[PDB]
Structure formats: structure tokens, C-alpha cells
Symmetry: D5
């Protein structure tokens, strides 16, 4: 019997395409396992893969959502990325398997 | 796929019509993207547009809502304006489209 | 175009009808405007009208909801009064409708 | 007219039947009045009645629920007792009814 | 007549199989009694049983669920194990049953 | 025997002399008693005395300090008025000393 | 040897001599042991002695300081009582001996 | 008889001279009035003067301290600027006068 | 060079001699190293040594102070035990090498 | 004129030489400038330098102190490293200099 839910939360970094400087973030994933739990090692790998990558955080959220789906194919996955830029607090959510 | 939700939060200022003096506020916008995400620089410009402008926090929330719809036309947007006035904590909310939670 | 929801929160005072002592509270009002937003100055007046009034907080929440309904007639109001009495934290909520 | 909802929260104590030792707790009650508001005085008596009584918090919660139901017969009541024992944070909830019946 | 819901929360530890080091956790259990309440003392022994045991937290949450179901056969139980590994905050949940819909 | 220190904190209001609107504040008072503790009722009256009065919070802090001194003559008093004006958090402190036994 | 410092904190109640109603408080005790530590049971008895007693919190703080001094004679003790009365937060401090640096 | 200490806190903005992008900050000032209390309007104008100015936050703090000294000459002033850049929380303090 | 200061904090438990029951606590140690830094594993072992031991939290603090002194001999050590007992929050401090 | 004090705080990571596993940390540096301010970009690279490095957090604090002193020789520096390991909250402080007393 697998867990019914896993939540993962960690910090990461990427390169902001506009400024071209390092943009730190906090990322959260929540998923319902379907016969496979994502190794913590592998998740960190996915998050650290964005270091030095020019990518906007909106596309980071969706990209990581796609990675988790390709790795363990859960019926429900939510990814939230939180960061700060030019005095604004920003959160972007990507979600697959929620309401239609 | 687009993100399913974006939340933005920042501080701004306007001129209060009743007191005739500068009033601080905190503003949050939550929206369901459809196509492009609102650039943060653009959001900051919208909020900054109210500096020096005499406008009630009720009307500012509604105005900002219409500015976000004009720019990125999301199916759902909610704007919340929080401020402190004469010892009263005030939140004003302006919302267009269907409930997300 | 009215906003779709307003939240107001502030401190006030009443008089405890048993001891005749000042009884401090925090009050939160939440309403859906229908074409009229209650002016903050008017809200403060309503809350301040309870100074010197002997009234239990259970009745004040109901009384205040009535003042708001009569002033701006919203379709949904909720009034929450919080206070602390004989070592009990009390919240009293008075409503009218869904959300 | 009655309030639509009341919440009450206070501290109390009982005696742990294992060690015969004082067993402090926090208790919260929420209920929907139906024609009758429980006096705060009377709630505090109900809570203080457990002082020096040997009773498990699992039983106290249910006992207090019954007491509130007997005093004001609300359509909904929920009693929560929170305490600390052998390094374990415990909450016991006892709940009755709902809206509608 | 028993409670409607009990929530228990405490700290524990196991041994991480990959690094052979102590893997500290917080565990939360919530359940609906059906004519048996889980004694707190029995709960704390279940949780302490993992001290020195090599077991992934994903397995631990499920194992502890199975322990609680076996002790009191409740119609609903949820176990949540929170730990911190390689800079990642982890929460693993195991569930069984629930309240059928308040019709 | 009297306490070594008392701290009091409450909310009040005054009138901003420029705008003539309500200027809400939080006020904290610390004092070392000299044989005599200020009644709370009397402190509340002092604070409530600024209601409707046009005065700057600078001045208020000092005025209240003087009222406390005139009433129970402590060898040490400190008054702190905190308010929020044109998006600036402001704290004004006034303090006064003397000799003990 | 003894500890260098103990701090204790708990809630109590007394009866307000003006309103005659139960008057809740928080009390902290800090002291430097000299050869003996106050048993927690003993402390809780002291704090519970005020239940049902008409006493001002300012008098209570000093009274509890004396009880502590009588029980275990520490070279430094400080007692702080915090309560809420007519919209004012009150802290009363009673202190005895040379103060920590 | 005037105040023994004033504490002011607010938000502002400057322009980062490397990135040329908006560099948002919180500023705290405390000072001992001697004679003169700084008008809040006037303090606010000091802080707002940095908006659209290319100035590093270490310079700004010092610049603002001199402004408060030039306006009201207190025997003690302390200015703290807090900001966030590339994932680092930064506080710059510029302090003058005071007995020990 | 050694660090100038170390703080450790963790949870543990003992057995209350009054009630006979397990008594949980939080413990903090602060020391100035002189040569030796206490291995965290070793600290954990000292705090875990109190499990199933009948001891008052007052004595516990002093006992752990003497263990740390015995292990790494710092010129300054402070131990603080915090617990909750019969509705009373309790903090006990033991200190070695401050002003006497 | 230089600032009187600068505080920097960020998150980093290293590898525990005992367990061989990544440990996350928060690090704060506080210093008094003497006519050189450490550019932020430089501080960030000092902290990033520990990623994958097998080093005890005790040694990290002292090693980072020494990097700040070498780079800008301030008359006071304090480095604090905070982390969590086997259920223990740890803070290591490395400190050099100060304000010379009157």
C-alpha cells in the first residue's frame, strides 16, 4: 500500500531571462502516488536542474509538473513556485488532475 | 498548459479623497492564466499608476481589476486591497469570473 | 461597479450590564455591497455608539448587523465580535445569508 | 434574535486517573444557538466542574458535549479538548448534529 | 459514548536506510474511534518502536497506519510523517476510510 | 509594598491638526511607582481625553507623560505613541527621571 | 548544585475588588536559586490560592513575590502579572535583590 | 520638553546601477531630537527622492543619514536599509553620534 | 581556529520522579569551544541518556552541563531545559564560567 | 563615508563528511566596513563555493569568516551558520574583531 499523498518542499535557483541574474525560489509539490513514490534524491535533481537555466518561473512550474508526471505518473500533481522580483511576491501554480 | 493560478502581492500608495493625504495599501491579485502571464514589470506599473492619484480604495480595486483583464484577459481575476484607515483595517475585494476553490 | 466583498475590523467598547464596567471588544464585519459601500466613518460611528451602552456582546453582534443592513442593505453580512470574559475567549457571529 | 454561531475557549484542569496528577487542558466549544445562548458564567462553571475530578480527556470532551446539549439543545455543537501527555499533543473532539438536521 | 475524532501528534526517529543515520520526524495521527480509543501510552510505544530501525518514512507512515488499524479498527485513520532530508521538507500521508458523505 | 514597575498599553485617538481627521494610535506607558499605583480607570480617562482634540502625536506623548507625573509622581516614566501616517510607521518616545528613597 | 536561574509561567485568576467578577491573569516568576528550587506543585498552589480572593493584580504580584521569598529565599526574584482591564493591557512587576546584568 | 526618541519606518525604491532595475527597500530611522523633530512629510520626501535614482543601497543609507543630520542635527541618528538581491537579504546600517 | 560559539537545541525526555510518568523537554546548550567542538552525535547521545531515567528537570540541566564540561571542557557553557508540567511552563538554566 | 554595519543572509548547502549527504544551511555574515564593501555577488559566490564540499558546519563558519576577512579586512566580522542534523538544531558562530572599547 503506497502513501495516499506526498508533499515536498525545497529551495531552488534559476536565471531570470530578463535580468539574466539568479532568481531564487521556493518550490512545493503535492501528489497522489500511483504505485511509485518519487525518490527524494530524484526530486532534488529535478529542482537543481534549473540552476543556471534561463527560465521564467511560470514555465518552471509547468516544466517540473511535467517531470514529476513523466517520472512517477500520479493521477494528481500540484506544483507551486514562490519567488520575489522587483518588490512583488509571486506564486505560480500548475496542477494536473484537479477540477476539469 | 498554462499555470492554473498566479498570485501577486505588493505595496502601493494613493491619495485618500476623505483625508486628502497619502494612504498606503497592500494589494493582491489572483488570476487563472489563459495565454500569457502578466509581466511583473507591467503589474508594478499598474499599481504605481495610483501614486499621487486621489481615488477611494473601493474604486482602486475595481480599476486595477479592469487593468489586469485589459492586459491578459484571464477567465478569473480577484483583486484585494488592504489598508488601515482611522483605526479600521479595511479589505476591499473585486472579482470577475467563476470561483476557483 | 461595486466591489464584490468588503471586510472591516476594529476595536470598540460597551458596558457589561452585570458589573457596569467597560467591556472591550474586536469586531469584524464582512459584507457584499449592492451598489453602496458603507463609509468607514459611518462604520466607526456605529461601533462607537456602543460606548456607554449596557449590552451583552451576543446582542451587540446582532444589533450591529441590523445597523449595517439598514444603512447599506447588503445581500450578505456577517458580524463577528470577539472578547474575553472571566478567562473565556468568546466569539459571537451574526449573519445574514450564504457565500 | 440569536447569534448564528458562538465559539468559546478557555483553560481547565482535571486529574489524570493513571498518575492521580493534575492534567491541564484547553477546551473550545462551538455551537449554533437555537433560541438559547449558553451564559459564559454557566460555561465556565461546566469547565471548572472537572477540577479535582479523575476523568480521561477522551471522556471529558463527551461529557461536556452532553452538558451543553442538555443546557441549550443546539442543532450543532462541537467540543475540542487539547492537552499534552507523555510528549504527545492530544486533541479530542466530540461533535453532535449539523445543519440541516 | 466515544469521541468523534482524536488527533495525536508527537516526535519520533528511525534510521535512514540509505545513509545509516538517524532520521528524525514528526508524526500526526488522526482517527475516528469505534468503541476503542487508542491509549496514548500504546500510541507512543508504536512510534518509539522505530528507534534504531532502518525504514523509509514512506513505509513508516503506512506501517504505523497498519499498527493503529490493528489496535482499534477505526473507520477512518490518517497518518502523516514529516521529516527533512537533503534540504527537502517531506510529508508523507497514509489514509484509510473516512466519513461517508453527510448524505 | 508597591510594585517595582508597571506597564500599561491601550488604543486611543486624537485629531490630526492639519487634516482634521481622526488620528488613531497605540500608547504604552512604563513607570516605577513611588508608593502609589495609577488606577487603570484614571489612565483610561487620560488617554480618552485626547479624543476630538487637535494635537500632534509628538506633543501627545509629552502631554500624557506630564499627566502621569502630575498624578502619581513616579521617579521614572516613559510614554511611547505609535501611529501610522502617510505610510510611515511612527514611534514617539518621551521619558522623564528623578531620584528614589 | 542548584540551577543558575529558573523561570515559571502559568495562568491564574482572582476576583476584581471593583467589579467583583473573576479576573484572569498570566504570571511569570524568574528567580536565582540559592540551594533550593521551588517545587512546581508548590508554585501552582501559590498561584491557585488567589482563586476566589478579592485582590488587585498589583497587590497580587507583590504578594506572590513574598510567598516565593518565604518558600525558598532566592537572592533575586521577579514576578510579573499581566491582565486586561477596560481595554488596557497591564503588566505589574515586583522585583527583589540585585538585578541580572 | 520634547521627545527623547523617534522611530520611523517606511518602504521605498531606488535603481540598481548594475542591473538598471528597480531596487525596492524598507528603511528604518531612529533619532534623538535636539531641538528639532523631523516632519513626517519631510522624511517621506527624503525617502521618495531615491525613486528612479541609480544609487547602491550602501550609499543610500549614508546619503539618508546625512540628510537627517543636515535637516535636524540630532546627536544620535541611525538609518537601516533592508533589501533583497540575488537571494541574499541585505541590511545596511549607517549610524552617527550617541554616547556608548 | 575553533568557532567562537555553538548553540545546540533538541527535544528529549526523562521520567518524572513525582508522577512516575514520561516528561518531555526541550534542551538548549550554548558553549564557547576551546579546542574541541562536541560532535552532534555525542550531544544527541547525552540528551537520549535521560530517557527512562528518574530525574528532576532542575538536576537534569546541571547533569548535562557537567557532561558537556567533562567532554569538551569549554570555558563557558550554558544549559537551558524547557518543559510544561501541571499547566506550568518551566525553564531551568545551568551556567558555568559567567560572572560568579 | 562607509556604512557602519552590513548584514547579509542567505541559504546554502554543503555535504556532511559523516553521512555523505547534503546538508542545507542558513548563513548570516555581519561586518563593519573599513573602506571596502563586499559586493553581494562575491558573498553569494563564497557561499555557493560550499555546494558539494565535504565540510563540517563548524569549519564552514570559520572558513567563510576567513574569506570575508581576506576579501575586505573589516575590523569586526561575525559569521553564523544554522542547520538541522539528526534532530538537532545547530548554530555555529565564528567571530573576529569588534568595536575597540573606549
Amino acid at each position: 500500500k503506497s502513501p495516499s499523498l506526498v508533499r515536498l518542499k525545497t529551495r531552488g535557483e534559476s536565471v531570470c531571462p530578463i535580468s539574466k541574474t539568479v532568481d531564487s525560489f521556493e518550490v512545493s509539490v503535492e501528489y497522489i502516488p500511483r504505485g511509485a513514490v518519487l525518490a527524494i534524491e530524484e526530486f532534488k535533481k529535478m529542482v537543481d536542474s534549473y540552476r543556471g537555466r534561463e527560465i521564467l518561473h511560470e514555465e518552471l512550474a509547468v516544466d517540473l509538473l511535467e517531470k514529476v508526471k513523466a517520472a512517477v505518473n500520479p493521477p494528481y500533481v500540484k506544483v507551486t513556485v514562490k519567488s520575489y522580483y522587483i518588490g512583488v511576491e509571486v506564486e505560480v501554480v500548475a496542477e494536473s488532475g484537479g477540477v476539469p
